[PDB]
Amino acid sequence: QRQDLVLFSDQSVLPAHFFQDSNSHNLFFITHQSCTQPLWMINALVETHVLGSPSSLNESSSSMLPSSTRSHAVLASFIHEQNYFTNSLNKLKIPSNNYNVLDFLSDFIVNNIHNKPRDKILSDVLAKFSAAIQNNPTDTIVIIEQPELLLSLVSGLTCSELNNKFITPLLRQCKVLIIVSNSDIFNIDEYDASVHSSNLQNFYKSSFIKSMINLNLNPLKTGFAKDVTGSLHVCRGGAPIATSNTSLHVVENEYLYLNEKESTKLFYR
Amino acid sequence: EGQLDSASEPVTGMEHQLSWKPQGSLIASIQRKTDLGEEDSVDVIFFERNGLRHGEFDTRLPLDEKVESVCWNSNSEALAVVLANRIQLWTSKNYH
Amino acid sequence: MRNLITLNKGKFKPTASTAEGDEDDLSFTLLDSVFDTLSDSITCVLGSTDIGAIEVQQFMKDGSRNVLASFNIQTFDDKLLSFVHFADINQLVFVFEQGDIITATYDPVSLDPAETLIEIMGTIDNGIAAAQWSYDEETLAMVTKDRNVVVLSKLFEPISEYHLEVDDLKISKHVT
Amino acid sequence: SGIAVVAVMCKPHRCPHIAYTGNICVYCPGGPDSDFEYSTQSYTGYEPTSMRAIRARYDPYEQARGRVEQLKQLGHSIDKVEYVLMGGTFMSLPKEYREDFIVKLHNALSGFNGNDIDEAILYSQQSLTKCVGITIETRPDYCTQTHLDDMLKYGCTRLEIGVQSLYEDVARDTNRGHTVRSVCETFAVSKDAGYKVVSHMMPDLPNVGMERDIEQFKEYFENPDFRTDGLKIYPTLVIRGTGLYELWKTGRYKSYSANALVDLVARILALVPPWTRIYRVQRDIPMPLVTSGVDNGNLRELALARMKDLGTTCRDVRTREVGIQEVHHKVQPDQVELIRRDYYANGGWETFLSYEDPKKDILIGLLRLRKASKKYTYRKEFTSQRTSIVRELHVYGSVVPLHSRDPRKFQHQGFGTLLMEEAERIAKEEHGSEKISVISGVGVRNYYGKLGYELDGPYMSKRI
Amino acid sequence: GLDSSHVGVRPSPATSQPTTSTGSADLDSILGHMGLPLGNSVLVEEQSTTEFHSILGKLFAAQGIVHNRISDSSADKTRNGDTHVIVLSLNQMFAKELPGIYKGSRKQMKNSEYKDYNHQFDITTRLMPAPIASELTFIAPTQPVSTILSQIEQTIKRNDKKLIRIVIPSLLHPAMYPPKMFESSEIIGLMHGVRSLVKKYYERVVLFASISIDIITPPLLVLLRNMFDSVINLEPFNQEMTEFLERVYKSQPGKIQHGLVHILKLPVFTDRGEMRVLKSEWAFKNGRKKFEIEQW
Amino acid sequence: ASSSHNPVILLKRILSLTESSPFILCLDSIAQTSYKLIQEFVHQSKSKGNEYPIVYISFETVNKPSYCTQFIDATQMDFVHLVKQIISYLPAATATQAKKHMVIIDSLNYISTEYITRFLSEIASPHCTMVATYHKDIKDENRTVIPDWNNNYPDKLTLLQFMATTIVDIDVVLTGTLDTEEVSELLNEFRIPRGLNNDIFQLRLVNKRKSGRSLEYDFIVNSNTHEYELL
């Protein structure tokens, strides 16, 4: 029943030579319907970057502690806190010391962003990663989680300023960037966000233009069943692949996935 | 949480062999029938979750055996019968 | 129309550990051997019940013998019913017939059992007829000799208790 | 063309299985004892056929003649009609009533005015407006060999024996007088006689869960005993006058929601073997008198949307039929092949032959063949040597256009001969038979008499 | 570590975690944990102008006071249970609105040892009497967010022993909340900081809130619904269905209901990737004793 | 005490002001204005043998009607003075349910939404009985909602519908050979076919009662013989 998870022509999810090529950049865009959460995919990405294989889906997860590995990993998010990241991701056993974890929720709201000039806020939030990645320059992967929420935090900010002040510098400085977000704004029944709420959707469209691969986790259609949870889509993003080899491209396939007790299963219709 | 759901239906000769089919259909147990006629044999009996009898099949063993445990495969294919010396594997196709 | 055929038939003998150079057995019989969770390991436990000594050691896929605990209980004639290991928090669970649930603690870097601690968490009086774990290693159900069944959590807290009775019979025949 | 279905009604009566259980089965609505009291059981008397039957005071001659003339006057011309009987248990009634009923039903079309049913059927064989069989409804307790001989003499071709469940508590708690296991021997004896057999099912019943509903259907389709040639699924709807409404009144009953039922139907339709014709998941109900349940007019209209979202769409006969002529010939079909399946069912081996398009899975023609066994046959025709029976011939391959160079002006008129000779080949080679027989309605006893089959008793047979 | 008092808590049958109880009859049953896990907030919603949910907004809070008031020389175990309930409203009528205990029965059977569990309640009976400011406090919402965020942290820090239960009665009611706070940044930052504080003290703090959605633009609702970890929606019947039920139901006054229940989000169950949305299956009813949720 | 009122009798009961709430909303358009509605109010209110003193607030009315006793014109003067002048002809006492000072408003389009509540929070006294009118078709001024990403505040219609205890709306029946589709087509062209501003109109009524529930009522109203019937 079970099927392998392949995302490239080289029969490998995350090619190693991507990290071996200098003067290059790449961007992944992941969208999940907010009735489900893509954590079980972030875990797989981190394991396959560090351990070199999907250590929860295709491989066993009994030695899942990538701490103090020759590689590196940096995760930052706004939706949750440092306490949740430590306690949970260590209960999920996501590494610590060869690893960086960044909160922007706990105690950050209380007059540390509020009632301060916007330019200083943007400069400092960029400098956090600009300084946290100086240690290991070329063997890290960085993922940001739902950054568009910050748009609603800053007093009167549009897509363009946030994008050109946060996203593009991050991808220029770092090798590869992964951005994950949710898409409820496009799923309000009998209401059009295109009336006056297009500012947020502009960010999604811009990111999809700039992205290289597009990962989609979407819920089932009309009803709810037991043996299947959701649908998994892989698509080619807007930007082309900045690699140096020529035969490389992206495989094109759709999966049906079930999640239960942190255990995920993928198969075909 | 430790509540009661149902209690089994009394049958004659039911031994201490208890095992559940992983798919979730039938309880497997061992019965010995020593009554008159030629019906006397050693059988395997299946019990629904409501404590109601359903299905049966006889082993061709002599009536003097002593079976220790009955094992369901990790899937719904193999049934392992455990004896003192021999261990037997049974599987079904077309309900036979 | 298919048939079943045999591919492999492997075997070995768990070698009991003693300080002697020849290092033969001490009438140590194995009580339980398990399938470890796909980590190329087989955790076995042996012992001598009359003197009251037990030993748990992992057999590696290559064949390297590693001992994590070898401890002697003060009492004897205490037969086991279920031993498991979580392999994520790295503890050990033993179920004895007298009523003691044994919780052992070990470290990965400690090759020798010198740092394996023991805990004798709350006893169940009047012995225990049987006990069993679930597939997910979360629910601990057991039955005492006095027709009382108790369900405990994964952290040794009581989910519930209930007195099994011959007078309880949900008959399949009511005349309504 | 001109296939016609003309339903008739029998006089009201009482099925005797009430006698040893006390009342009608719980789900049966209406009846003589109910307030209606001029109506056969399982029918409220408010159907159009009920109206046409009442005004004729339940007479077969008038009902048949009136329905035939109405259909002819509407704009269709009829030359092929199949009768279907309804209501209670027709076989319970005394001897003379059934004989007179059948003789009247045949003399309505034949134009004959005699008696001595043998002569009536003999004249009906040589008549215009041919009859293509009868459909008699009967219970397991009345399918003994004498009754089977009666039905064979009458001219019936297919039965429909309901089971309604496979569990054993349901039989006693629904006040239905037969153990489940006896239906298997009923099927075994019936099939060896050449009678196509169809059953009934009802998903929701008291003290039945969604699980048990699932694996009862799974066991029905998998077990080599419950393999039959048709099915009917009746979702449980609660009429006020039934014994089901009392349970809801006392609070001893509750039904399923809409989502649960649509999911159940979606799962069920994804398991049908490709030789069984799902008749009606969207059955016909007395609408306003139902008090509990859900709407059933478009269950499959949503189940199809469900299979399009989960995959593995239906594979029954009905969805794959192309018809006699130009139903879906708006597009030229694809590769045509012969597909032959074999299965073990009710103590015997049976073969299903079909002419199908494998790329898009449509159906053009089919044939069924059975190798007679030795532990169930009793007829003096089948107890003399080995023999095989063609239970059903079905040729929608009367299609004029086709794929892969259809006959120009011969237009598949010899298409059925292909299947007939194909059947004879394996009858001579594989079965090793010494006689082959085909069962058919009396009106079509000549489309088989040209290929060499000769008449013996109610059968069309030829040796090897 | 530090000292802590849990006013009442049992292991979660579903995942072996500390779980409190709202005091409800079937709402605690449908939360998946047979209760509310220690740390995850909840949300309940009503379609129309009715005020059914208001009743629930009382029960929870009252339960805590009981769980604190039946320990002072009224519980032989004298078990350490302390709560300091905080209410954010511009009207103080709640200070004299807690419903009365029916007969007690805080049994759970079917740091200290916590056996306390739900009580028996009835709506007609008022409480006897009501807590003093030392047990329960009111904060007006119209003050600037800086003062509120400082004061909540001060209250929790200065009362480290106590268990924390917070209730927000009818958040975003136009009769008390001015348009100058309907601006997008204000409320979302307020709740973002509230979630920060709540999960910071994950051991014992629990929060509860409810709003009205008929007068809220969908974008703000979407922004808000990701802040919490559980969403329950109550939709009352139309007039026609009510008249149909009353015309059909002639032998039962108690079988009359008011509407149905929809499940949009659950506790930790959902964060492991579980599709838990389930709508148009349950039915709610307000009653003389408690709040009933049954199948329809 | 009377309860479970006859729907026509209940319609009279509200129209006779046997019951009373500190806020009543009435809606009108350019197809049927509400002068005859006030006529019905005074016809079925003072027929009980009651005076019902009336205070008038005008934003669109030009002349002093016969209904009102006192007078105040609010076009020249503004909010900060109307909050004063409203109390001058309105005592702060109890009992809306009976003969008190009834404050009537002809139009509510010309007050900023940002201060709708600040207004209404200081008028609906337990002696005060408020009734107001709103023009449905007239589009709200673009500077009342601020359609930017900051302002999540609702519009004017929903705010009034959520706040008012009881809602009454009216529409004109076209006795002619036309259809309301053609009437809308011509009105979108700003054309008036013959048959508008009649006297036999249709009405829609909603009252919030029983802890918040509501029931919609429809009738047929003749404003000459004062005939209320079912539709």
Ligand code: SF4
């Ligand atoms: S056997 Fe048929 S006719 Fe008799 S009670 Fe049952 S359903 Fe009705």
